[PDB]
Amino acid sequence: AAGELEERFNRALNCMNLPPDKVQLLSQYDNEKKWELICDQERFQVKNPPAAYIQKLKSYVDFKRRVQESTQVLRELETSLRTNHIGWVQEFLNEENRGLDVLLEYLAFAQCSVTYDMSRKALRNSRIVSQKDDVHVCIMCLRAIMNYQSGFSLVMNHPACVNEIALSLNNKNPRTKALVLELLAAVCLVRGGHDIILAAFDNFKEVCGEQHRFEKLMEYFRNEDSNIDFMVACMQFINIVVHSVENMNFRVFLQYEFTHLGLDLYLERLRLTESDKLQVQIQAYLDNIFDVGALLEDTETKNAVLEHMEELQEQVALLTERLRDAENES
Amino acid sequence: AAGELEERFNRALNCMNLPPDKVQLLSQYDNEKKWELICDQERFQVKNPPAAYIQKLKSYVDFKRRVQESTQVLRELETSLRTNHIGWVQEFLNEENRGLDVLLEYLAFAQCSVTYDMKALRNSRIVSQKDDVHVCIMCLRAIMNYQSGFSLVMNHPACVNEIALSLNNKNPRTKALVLELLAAVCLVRGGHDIILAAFDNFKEVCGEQHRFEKLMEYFRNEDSNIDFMVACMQFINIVVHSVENMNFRVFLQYEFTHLGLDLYLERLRLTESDKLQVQIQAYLDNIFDVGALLEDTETKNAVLEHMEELQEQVALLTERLRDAENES
Amino acid sequence: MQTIKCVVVGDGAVGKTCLLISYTTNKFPSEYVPTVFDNYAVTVMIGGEPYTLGLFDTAGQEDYDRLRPLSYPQTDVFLVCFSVVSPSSFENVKEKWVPEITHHCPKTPFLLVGTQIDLRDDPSTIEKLAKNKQKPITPETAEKLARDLKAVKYVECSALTQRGLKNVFDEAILAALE
Amino acid sequence: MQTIKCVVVGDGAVGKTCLLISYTTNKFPSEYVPTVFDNYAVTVMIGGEPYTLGLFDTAGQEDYDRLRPLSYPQTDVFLVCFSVVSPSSFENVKEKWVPEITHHCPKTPFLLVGTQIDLRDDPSTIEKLAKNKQKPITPETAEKLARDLKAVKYVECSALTQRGLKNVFDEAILAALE
Numbered sequence A: 001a002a003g004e005l006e007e008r009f010n011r012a013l014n015c016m017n018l019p020p021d022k023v024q025l026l027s028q029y030d031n032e033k034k035w036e037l038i039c040d041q042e043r044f045q046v047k048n049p050p051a052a053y054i055q056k057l058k059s060y061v062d063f064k065r066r067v068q069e070s071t072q073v074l075r076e077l078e079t080s081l082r083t084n085h086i087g088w089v090q091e092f093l094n095e096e097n098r099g100l101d102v103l104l105e106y107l108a109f110a111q112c113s114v115t116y117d118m119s120r121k122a123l124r125n126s127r128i129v130s131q132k133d134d135v136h137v138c139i140m141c142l143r144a145i146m147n148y149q150s151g152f153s154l155v156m157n158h159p160a161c162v163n164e165i166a167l168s169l170n171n172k173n174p175r176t177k178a179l180v181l182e183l184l185a186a187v188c189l190v191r192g193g194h195d196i197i198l199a200a201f202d203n204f205k206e207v208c209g210e211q212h213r214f215e216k217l218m219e220y221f222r223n224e225d226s227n228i229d230f231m232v233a234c235m236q237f238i239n240i241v242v243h244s245v246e247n248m249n250f251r252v253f254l255q256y257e258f259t260h261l262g263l264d265l266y267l268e269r270l271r272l273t274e275s276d277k278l279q280v281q282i283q284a285y286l287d288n289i290f291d292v293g294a295l296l297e298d299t300e301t302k303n304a305v306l307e308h309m310e311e312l313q314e315q316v317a318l319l320t321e322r323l324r325d326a327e328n329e330s
Numbered sequence B: 001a002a003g004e005l006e007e008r009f010n011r012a013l014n015c016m017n018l019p020p021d022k023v024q025l026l027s028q029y030d031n032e033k034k035w036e037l038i039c040d041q042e043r044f045q046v047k048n049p050p051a052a053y054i055q056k057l058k059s060y061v062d063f064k065r066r067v068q069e070s071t072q073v074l075r076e077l078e079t080s081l082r083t084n085h086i087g088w089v090q091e092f093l094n095e096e097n098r099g100l101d102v103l104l105e106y107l108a109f110a111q112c113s114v115t116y117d118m119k120a121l122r123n124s125r126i127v128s129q130k131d132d133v134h135v136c137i138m139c140l141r142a143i144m145n146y147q148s149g150f151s152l153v154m155n156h157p158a159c160v161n162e163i164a165l166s167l168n169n170k171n172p173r174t175k176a177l178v179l180e181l182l183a184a185v186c187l188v189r190g191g192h193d194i195i196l197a198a199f200d201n202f203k204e205v206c207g208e209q210h211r212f213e214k215l216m217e218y219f220r221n222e223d224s225n226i227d228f229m230v231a232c233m234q235f236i237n238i239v240v241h242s243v244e245n246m247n248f249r250v251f252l253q254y255e256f257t258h259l260g261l262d263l264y265l266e267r268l269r270l271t272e273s274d275k276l277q278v279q280i281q282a283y284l285d286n287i288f289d290v291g292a293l294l295e296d297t298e299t300k301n302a303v304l305e306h307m308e309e310l311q312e313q314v315a316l317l318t319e320r321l322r323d324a325e326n327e328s
Numbered sequence C, D: 001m002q003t004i005k006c007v008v009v010g011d012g013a014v015g016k017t018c019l020l021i022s023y024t025t026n027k028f029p030s031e032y033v034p035t036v037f038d039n040y041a042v043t044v045m046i047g048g049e050p051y052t053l054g055l056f057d058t059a060g061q062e063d064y065d066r067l068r069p070l071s072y073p074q075t076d077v078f079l080v081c082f083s084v085v086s087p088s089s090f091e092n093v094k095e096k097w098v099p100e101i102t103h104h105c106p107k108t109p110f111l112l113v114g115t116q117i118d119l120r121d122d123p124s125t126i127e128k129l130a131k132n133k134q135k136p137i138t139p140e141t142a143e144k145l146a147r148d149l150k151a152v153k154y155v156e157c158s159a160l161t162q163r164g165l166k167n168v169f170d171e172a173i174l175a176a177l178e
């Protein structure tokens, strides 16, 4: 237990990808329960390198059902991405291993039967893997990659990456849908990130063969009343996409875009629920809604109170003319 | 030389489709110069019945020209709809003849050569000659001169959507007439919702990304014909600001801004055409700026609290001046 | 005896009525009135034989499209009119008027008639027309039109200056007898 | 000297730390502290032999996901926890927790442990849950689950009313030695 100056402590504290928030609380620990940590890091070892997972997943891309044990491989990769030292993620994502790509093409593979019921050699081989958890586990891996600062930046600069995630809303499981919306919601608020989400739904419009932007978002939100936690993340995504905008002419464009899709008359019926997160998310959206008519009526005409304010402006002056004359009568 | 002729005159007057404006401007004639009208009316005869044209036109739909006289037969068909007594029109458009239908059937036949530039085709490319096809629009414009027929145009589904498709024709005179036509239907009650459904149809059949975007290409890139630009600019100004709801106005306004309307209009404000400059400036005064409108709304409430600051400052000040005047 | 029926058709405000009044009484009128229908009668001499010349004035505006063909029956010669300084009025000849009269009165000879030649040199119309990027019709362009529309001949005149005005009706009468 | 290492994992505010503190001491804490990691040691006798029982308390918050697995090496038995009144805690057993412990330490036995049994009948927990269209987790559904995930056994517990609490840890020592 050698006592140097303890910045051997610094190395394992970074390499744990902890918010600066939590580094303030943790760095001010006792000296023993500080070095005691350092040596647990050095004793801890990683079971498998990222290449090991990469290979077995790339092979899944080309009877069959030899992939049956795939689901666990994805689950053991997610666990590896989320809980290992941050380097394991970088090694997974660098040019050599090229992890994001091979990961993304597998998701595209499992998901080409659900984007279609609405490359065929697989198309058949797609329906069986779509049943599985694979589609939903894969998204959990991206969720893991995007909490990592450098990896999150690598995702937005990838064209197809976010675009495939928008298609990941079609999976039949309500929990999966909700995850996609929280994720796409997140990418939406970063600078310049807003246009990438729309372009994803633009692609989403054609590949699903839908009339208007979204409108498929609107249907899953509208016709399903089963899951409470889905709508919460759903409703807040809509609240984001509309009122976060720079230009307010574009905001009201967007409000109508949803209004036309029957958002407003559905939300009046959905306002009855007292699910707290939902009661808050709905009312949060309604407080932000715009009405150009309303802004126009109270900018009606003349602004004649300006000269009623000028009658007041003339009154203070005249009153003061009598008070300075009072200093003279004094 | 009937001694009590009033009844006849009226019967052969409203069968002339005269506006209330022009029909009693006329009602005050000499009694002799009223009889004179009544007797030319019955002395005038219709050469050919509407069924005659239906047939010769319906048969044009199926190498060399039985469509030779098409251009002129359609052309005198237009003439007959416009200048014959309104009774002739009622008969042409009625259910037995179903004239509006068969007419629409032929235009579609001729204009599938022009919509497929930007089944068996056979005779359509030659019939696509601009004179054969364009008169057809004039036949419609004539039908829309008659009140009952104009409503008949609006409740026929394909009709208005079909007229919008004729915007693809390469002739500037044709384009302008289409736009002039669509403009009228757009402002009549509920007619705005009918025009949208027409251009929505236009988007899918032309295979384009945004809705009235093939239009924006036509408006921008041709500087040859001025009166086209006039009819075009007027169609756009109507479709955006004629609407009741003001949220829908800025929604529609934004969609055009996206099509690069405002950036083209900055250069087009330069023209020294009187007729276009007036229609352009009319659109420019009507534009909304939601940013500006919120800023002057804050201002209002803040001057309310400065008017409360003025109402409070005058109160304290005048109350202290009376306390000094009493201490005197 | 005999009579010659002549109907003047043409766009509104081409100067049809002034054309008929600056001919018969040589007085050029100040007042603008949208003419509904009117009838004038003048006796004219050809080869020592008295003809009664029928002059029919019709409306130009589209409201009387249903009324106008009442003047058409028994017409011996038509006058299709436009102004040389209004291209709008010009192309309505091919679009409206010529097809209108050839429907109602086929095999009836007609002359193509240009009016307001005096404004072809007018300064205020120079700029007004050029501002909308168009120019008045040269004598070359109209007589190539009359040759296509199977018109008898093309004549132009100004009711104001009366220049070639009498010439209009006389070349018109000659066509009336065929 | 021999020792039995036991690690407690589970979602945040599920009641892991109260489970360990209301066991070793009989004082039930109300105070909420988000534990980063902690260590406890109590000597327990098995077959009349003194074994030293190691209890490791780990973080629930997803911020310490990279910090937590330092407590895992050489773990003899796990305690995987969810709350019977929070289904959220329930489904994270399969998507997050069980696959996490079986990645780092495969072939290491674990117990499925439901906490906070006392609120299964409490009105305000019934209503708060029913308002979001949910129902507390039945004892049937928890062992419906346990077999599938290859858990040793399902034992349930409440730290507030110490109850069936001693039984959990006995069953944990029980899985540790085989």
Ligand SMILES: Nc1nc2c(ncn2[C@@H]2O[C@H](COP(=O)(O)OP(=O)(O)NP(=O)(O)O)[C@@H](O)[C@H]2O)c(=O)[nH]1
Pocket (backbone or CB within 6 Å): C010, C011, C012, C013, C014, C015, C016, C017, C018, C019, C029, C030, C031, C032, C033, C034, C035, C036, C058, C059, C060, C061, C115, C116, C117, C118, C119, C157, C158, C159, C160
């Ligand atoms: N400079 C000029 N003005 C003319 C000429 N002919 C007519 N005008 C004018 O143009 C205006 C319309 O003329 P008018 O004869 O009433 O036209 P019209 O074709 O009979 N119109 P409508 O069909 O409405 O009765 C009048 O103010 C008249 O003075 C012309 O040769 N030169």
Ligand SMILES: Nc1nc2c(ncn2[C@@H]2O[C@H](COP(=O)(O)OP(=O)(O)NP(=O)(O)O)[C@@H](O)[C@H]2O)c(=O)[nH]1
Pocket (backbone or CB within 6 Å): D010, D011, D012, D013, D014, D015, D016, D017, D018, D019, D029, D030, D031, D032, D033, D034, D035, D036, D058, D059, D060, D061, D115, D116, D117, D118, D119, D157, D158, D159, D160, D161
């Ligand atoms: N009703 C009831 N509440 C409990 C029980 N156990 C813990 N709690 C409460 O649940 C809340 C969270 O308990 P705690 O022991 O801090 O949870 P933890 O698993 O250690 N959370 P973390 O991982 O964040 O440190 C606390 O307010 C505590 O009082 C229980 O058995 N019954």
Ligand SMILES: [Mg+2]
Pocket (backbone or CB within 6 Å): C016, C017, C034, C035, C036, C057, C058, C059
């Ligand atoms: Mg006249």
Ligand SMILES: [Mg+2]
Pocket (backbone or CB within 6 Å): D016, D017, D033, D034, D035, D036, D057, D058, D059
């Ligand atoms: Mg704790």
